[PDB]
Ligand binder design. Sequence first.
Ligand SMILES: Cc1cc2nc3c(=O)[nH]c(=O)nc-3n(C[C@H](O)[C@H](O)[C@H](O)COP(=O)(O)OP(=O)(O)OC[C@H]3O[C@@H](n4cnc5c(N)ncnc54)[C@H](O)[C@@H]3O)c2cc1C
Ligand SMILES: [Cl-]
Ligand SMILES: [Cl-]
Length: 485
Amino acid sequence: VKNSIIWFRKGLRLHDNPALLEACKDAKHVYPVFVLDPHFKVSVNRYNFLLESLEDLQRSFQARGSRLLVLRGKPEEVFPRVFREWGVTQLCFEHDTEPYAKVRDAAVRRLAAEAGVEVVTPISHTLYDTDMLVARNGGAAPLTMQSFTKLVDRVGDPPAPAPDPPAAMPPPAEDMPSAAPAATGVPTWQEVGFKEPPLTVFKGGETEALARLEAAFQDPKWVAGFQKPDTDPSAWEKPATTVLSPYLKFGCLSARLFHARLLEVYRRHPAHSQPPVSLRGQLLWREFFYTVGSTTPNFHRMAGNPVCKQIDWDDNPEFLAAWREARTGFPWIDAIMTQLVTWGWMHHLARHSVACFLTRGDLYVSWERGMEVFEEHLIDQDHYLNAANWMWLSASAFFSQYFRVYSPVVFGKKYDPEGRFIRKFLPVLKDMPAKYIYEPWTAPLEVQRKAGCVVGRDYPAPIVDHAVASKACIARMAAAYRRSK
Ligand SMILES: Cc1cc2nc3c(=O)[nH]c(=O)nc-3n(C[C@H](O)[C@H](O)[C@H](O)COP(=O)(O)OP(=O)(O)OC[C@H]3O[C@@H](n4cnc5c(N)ncnc54)[C@H](O)[C@@H]3O)c2cc1C
Ligand SMILES: [Cl-]
Ligand SMILES: [Cl-]
């Protein structure tokens, strides 16, 4: 008989899950598995988001006669056991192009073959088979968004979302010891070792992802006319973009479903925005960075990375600490960095502000250091997207216009002159008059005292003078660029 495992890593969804559909086909028993390495820096925000995503999967599987098995251990150690215990003949999982995934998945494939297990690994985390895209482009990934968009337009539409799985699923076999409920339940953030609770406002799981998708498409005119660079990074009550990145990162939402819904709207709105600024463009940025990242060695590092300029970043731990701890003395910067740690998500241009500040803009700290801080706190932390955008923002790859430097004072003021965003994430400045809220060190001491926010006592003074720092950084950047002629 056919006993299959559908192994969840990303692709934490029932919809558009060809791995799942295959595992269920003609199956007597299906074991939906997630492998939790229990000795696993990572914020509780992201880890709890994953846990909530597993809980959602548990509910969906229980609604269909099955249940999610959260196995504790390393895959190489767990799968050999359950292959034989469950008499498994087929192992299915969504393909993953991350470096670790290639190593892990190769090891699992070898073990599967030893046990006579058929391995099926469809593509469904990305819009396209990214290796096919590289092959269609003559064997090398495009290195600009312009050429990437021309490639995908020549390739055509991505595959349609896979059908929904059956309303009843073949369950796991009863009395299998490795499937005992007490050993295979979804843990809470407390049980895995976290002491502080999650603070983010975005709940994980496919069910939330689909609801947020529908909310975004409630206004097709907004979807059609979406222009990413025109959106407001200070909007926090109702974020100006979809906030689907956490759900796309974990696969709670299919990118192909997202794309297909976009085309349905675009068909009815002929003036809809186009790439790169359109909502479809945003999925293409993701596809672009996955394609280049997956084919580039050491993509997440500077040294040994062929696409990354070698820059003489300062090893300045005090500057890094100040930025990381939201005490730069620039409320716009510190507010965004507070949003990072509390929500684990910020608007793209808020990420621009803090990343430019840390790297080529002001502090001249390496983008690898900023990426590590983002990697800890972002609930949408994505290996390729985080690396690519950090290289972009530091002018190390893809982007080279290092004379464009965001002001940590003026940038946010264009959107939010009252500083409502600052007042939300930095309550110490709640009473500061708007005239000074972006530059509190310029307020008269009487204003500071009346506002209950004395610079140097309640809120730090700026760690740099932007005018002086940005001029020095641009000088260093120009030098670094001449070095790599
Ligand atoms: C320094 C820095 C770090 C970043 N780190 C991450 C990260 O770890 N994970 C992540 O998903 N994005 C990352 N981004 C990209 C971007 O900031 C987020 O994808 C976006 O802010 C998420 O909001 P949204 O879902 O509302 O995006 P929308 O505008 O609604 O876009 C829809 C989707 O398109 C994709 N997308 C959008 N913008 C980009 C982009 N610039 N690059 C790649 N894909 C994009 C995401 O999957 C996103 O959910 C980073 C950007 C910068 C500058
Ligand atoms: Cl854009
Ligand atoms: Cl600016």
